[PDB]
């Protein structure tokens with residue numbers, strides 16, 4: 551599909567039994583999801599943006615479905631105000647910028 | 650162009666005769682540039698990112714050429730970690746997401 555940018559590029563994602571709305575975010579290196587108690591091993595990380603840093607948990611090889619497209623990879627989890635699909639998964643679903 | 654996302658979508662912009670590198674950021678509502686001088690009136694504003702809120706200077710109707718495409722719109726100047734082109738100007742240059 552083609553998503554214009556007149557509004558925030560929010561799409562439906564699924565991670566296990568949770569459907570969520572998330573931004574398709576070319577400015578994010580890695581996917582960051584709102585706090586959720588995912589199973590499995592993780593490592594602490596701090597990620598930085600406007601306003602400073604937040605602490606997140608890095609989970610690897612997590613399957614996520616994004617608008618019906620399958621992805622699997624690193625998912626950061628922490629107190630972000632918005633769910634963010636970053637470049638690590640945008641490439642897996644075939645997403646490009648075009649102008 | 651078509652821009653894939655295996656690397657950061659950094660592009661050269663021209664603003665006030667100056668060449669800068671900026672990140673095409675679909676998860677940003679607004680265009681935010683690192684500290685720089687711009688002419689004319691500005692308004693104090695605050696904006697929030699992943700790590701909290703910052704103070705910025707809001708300049709309206711500023712021309713920026715983004716990868717050869719002309720925009721004229723609002724530019725916020727302040728302590729962003731990197732220069733970002735947000736949706737306010739991505740829409741003007743006809744940028745969409747495609748997958």
Ligand SMILES: CCC(CC)CN(C[C@@H](O)[C@H](Cc1ccccc1)NC(=O)O[C@H]1CO[C@H]2OCC[C@H]21)S(=O)(=O)c1ccc(N)cc1
Pocket residue numbers: 575577578579580581582597598599600626631632634636672674675676677678679680681696697698699700729730731733735
């Ligand atoms: C270092 C480059 C940017 C910050 C500049 C990185 N951000 C993604 C960005 O798209 C963010 C994503 C974002 C969206 C909404 C809330 C927080 C973050 N947007 C953002 O800060 O936009 C601000 C400018 O316009 C405004 O509209 C949205 C917030 C304002 S981020 O959220 O801080 C971020 C950093 C690291 C990872 N892995 C994932 C995300």
